[PDB]
């Protein structure tokens, strides 16, 4: 990645063995759970397109998800080419050549060019643009690998209220439903899917109670 | 390897125990799975020929693969000699064994890599090694792409997983993988999925294919 040293210089460094191993292990353990994506973003802090491709390539299995990821990258790259046509002509002195979709993906661009764009003034954040594409693809994978729908979440007889709320928002997170639908879904389904005991207790509080007030009232 | 200090200069650094240990473990655990090579390239970032030889020599087992690796390096080095048969501010031209770190000193290797313009004896040696590793991966590949058929109970996701995992290990030509994608992925799916996939019609994304066969 390109980080800042102790002298305030934006220089290029190799990916640490720790970062490499941390990313490999989180994929082996958490697969494509929703919390893998923020982990990827943090481990790829200041990464170049070359670094991003490195982290992706070190993944052993999940080649279906990886293939889906390549297709998502192709979409955003073509959309980039459509909105940013590279004007043919000589490059002005002290300037970089304007990047194509494949340049951002690190396919047709060298490390030197990537460092050139990222440390330019003003910078062309090819690493951040690529990462945006990758995360966009990863979010699609998470939704697809989400086993259950939010409709299938209802509190059991013996199951405590907290354990039910846990499964509710865990499912809702992986579903990644539109923000508008999500708010309406919580105000409608959460109370409605509780056991007959708790459901009436939440009613006594009146609509508009915090989750803290709800969960506190449904203990026991 | 070669890193940049606070004076903005490219200087030599001792290879870390963490880099060494990481490489040893990934070979012991992942053997010669396809993802071992990108791991090697990352762990050998900015490495000298000396460092590269160190990583290879720390490998305990797989001596059959290591011997094959030696031969691949020899051929690529002998070819360098065949393709390449001093100035006050420059340095001498590196031979095949010089890039391989056999007949070159650490100082010479540092000299070439830190030179302006640089002679990347590290990246050149890496190139040959990765070439050797690719041959080993192909050989240690257990299954052909033709033998990848979706099981009766196997979900479509796991099938595509085994499909492209196998395809990756075989490392064939780029467009023959596309030939397989177009003529084997749907062909070798179980009758239930195969009916839906053909109902979609040609020109469907993998995301569309996997969503449709999710049940």
């Amino acid at each position: 990645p390109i980080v800042q040293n102790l002298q305030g210089q934006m220089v290029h460094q190799c990916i640490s063995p720790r970062t490499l191993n941390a990313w490999v292990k989180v994929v082996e353990e958490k697969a494509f759970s929703p919390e893998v994506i923020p982990m990827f973003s943090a481990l790829s802090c200041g990464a170049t397109p070359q670094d991003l491709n490195t982290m992706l390539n070190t993944v052993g299995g999940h080649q279906a998800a990886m293939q889906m990821l390549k297709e998502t990258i192709n979409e955003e790259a073509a959309e980039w080419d459509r909105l940013h046509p590279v004007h043919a002509g000589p490059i002005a002195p002290g300037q970089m050549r304007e990047p194509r979709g494949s340049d951002i993906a690190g396919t047709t661009s060298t490390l030197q060019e990537q460092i050139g764009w990222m440390t330019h003034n003003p910078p062309i954040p090819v690493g951040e643009i690529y990462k945006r594409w990758i995360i966009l693809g990863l979010n699609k994978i998470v939704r697809m690998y989400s086993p259950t729908s939010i409709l299938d979440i209802r509190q059991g007889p013996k199951e405590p209220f907290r354990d039910y709320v846990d499964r509710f928002y865990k499912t809702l997170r992986a579903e990644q439903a539109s923000q508008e639908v999500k708010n309406a879904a919580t105000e409608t389904l959460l109370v409605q899917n509780a056991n007959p005991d708790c459901k009436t207790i939440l009613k006594a509080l009146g609509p508009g109670a915090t989750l803290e007030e709800m969960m506190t009232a449904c203990q026991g | 390897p070669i890193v940049q200090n606070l004076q903005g200069q490219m200087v030599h650094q001792c290879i870390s125990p963490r880099t060494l240990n990481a490489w040893v473990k990934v070979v012991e655990e992942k053997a010669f799975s396809p993802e071992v090579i990108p791991m090697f390239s990352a762990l050998s970032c900015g490495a000298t020929p000396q460092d590269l030889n160190t990583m290879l020599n720390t490998v305990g087992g797989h001596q059959a693969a290591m011997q094959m690796l030696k031969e691949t390096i020899n051929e690529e080095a002998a070819e360098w000699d065949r393709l390449h048969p001093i100035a006050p501010g420059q340095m001498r031209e590196p031979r095949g064994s010089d890039i391989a770190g056999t007949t070159s000193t650490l100082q010479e290797q540092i000299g070439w890599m830190t030179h302006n313009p640089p002679i990347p004896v590290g990246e050149i040696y890496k190139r040959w090694i990765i070439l050797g590793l690719n041959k080993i991966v192909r050989m240690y590949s257990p299954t052909s792409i033709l033998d990848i058929r979706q099981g009766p109970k196997e979900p479509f996701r796991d099938y595509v997983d085994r499909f492209y995992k196998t395809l990756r290990a075989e490392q064939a030509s780029q467009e023959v993988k596309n030939a397989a994608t177009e003529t084997l992925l749907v062909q070798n799916a179980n009758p239930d999925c195969k009916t839906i996939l053909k109902a979609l019609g040609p020109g469907a994304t993998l995301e569309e294919m996997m969503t449709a066969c999710q049940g």
Partner: peptide
């Protein structure tokens, strides 16, 4: 025209 083909490693040049 597409950046990555099926079976192609990430960041591999054409």
């Amino acid at each position: 025209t597409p950046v990555l083909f099926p079976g192609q490693p990430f960041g591999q040049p054409p």
